[PDB]
A paper describes a structure:
MsrA is specific for the S-isomer of methionine sulfoxide and MsrB for the R-isomer. The anaerobic gram-positive bacterium Clostridium oremlandii contains a selenocysteine (Sec)-containing MsrA (CoMsrA). This enzyme is found to be a structurally unusual MsrA composed of two domains, a catalytic domain and a distinct helical domain absent from other known MsrA structures.
In an asymmetric unit, there are two molecules of ΔH-domain protein, but each molecule shows different crystal structures. The final refined model contains chain A comprising 134 residues (7–140) and chain B comprising 137 residues (6–142). The monomer structure of the ΔH-domain protein folds into a similar rolled mixed β-sheet with three helices located at the exterior sides. The dimers are made by swapping of the N-terminus between two molecules. Each N-terminus including residues 6–18 extends outwards from the original molecule of full-length form, intruding between β2 and β3 of another symmetric molecule and forming a complete rolled mixed β-sheet. The ΔH-domain protein predominantly existed as a dimer in solution, which is in agreement with the crystallographic data. The C-terminal region, including Tyr140, of the ΔH-domain protein is transformed into a flexible loop from the original helices structure. Loss of interactions with the catalytic domain by deleting the helical domain leads to collapse of the active site, thereby causing a loss of activity.
Residue numbers in the entry:
A (entry chain A): 7 to 140
B (entry chain B): 6 to 142
Write the structure that this text describes.
Amino acid sequence: LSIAVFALGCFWGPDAQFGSIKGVVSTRVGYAGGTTNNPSYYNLGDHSESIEIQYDANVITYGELLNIFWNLHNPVYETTNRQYMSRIFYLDDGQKSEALEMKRQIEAANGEKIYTEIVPLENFYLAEGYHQKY
Amino acid sequence: KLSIAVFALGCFWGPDAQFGSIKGVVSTRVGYAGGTTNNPSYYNLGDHSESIEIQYDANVITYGELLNIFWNLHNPVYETTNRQYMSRIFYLDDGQKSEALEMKRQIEAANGEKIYTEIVPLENFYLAEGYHQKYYL
């Protein structure tokens, strides 16, 4: 086969991953709950670092996105910690239906338990930049 | 009017400054522990964080004295999810477990504030890079 070798450096990109997809028009990093009150960077409670993906469903579907999401990480570890967990926050019953569905597939396909949690999007805070001091 | 200095000191220097020159402590090694993944690496730590292995001579210093040093080095009275404010004791046997729990309760009783230090069993410990374990490629 052929071989390419690239170094990305530091100026990427948990959002750049999804942003590079055909049909997603913008992405924002944010913190998604979860119903813990008053999350902070010091204590996120049940909120998780998340990507809000605004996409044109005439170009990609929610199931195609689901597919790339699952190929972009390896959620085969038991972990209680909301912050290290693979999570899907559904916005409707359809997304949820679709997300439970493909999870079942993948688990069969390989046998492994997949630990992605399916929970409704109840809160979403944009990420704040750190305050500069002068 | 006060004056300002700004310094950067890497995290892995801390262990030897915190415990290294304590009488009875023979060595300290920085590592990674407390996560899930079978093999963290320089490129991805998974859910592990900075931990320290302290080798000590019990005829000189006790585990209790080390716990007192650990709790004199920080003030874990706020719930946190943040790795930079981690407070964790990894007990190697039930003797260490019970000494850590008993001292935690004593601190809580004496100062009136819940202590958010987690006391959990040591399962795996990975040796991290250092000036005496450079990990030459």
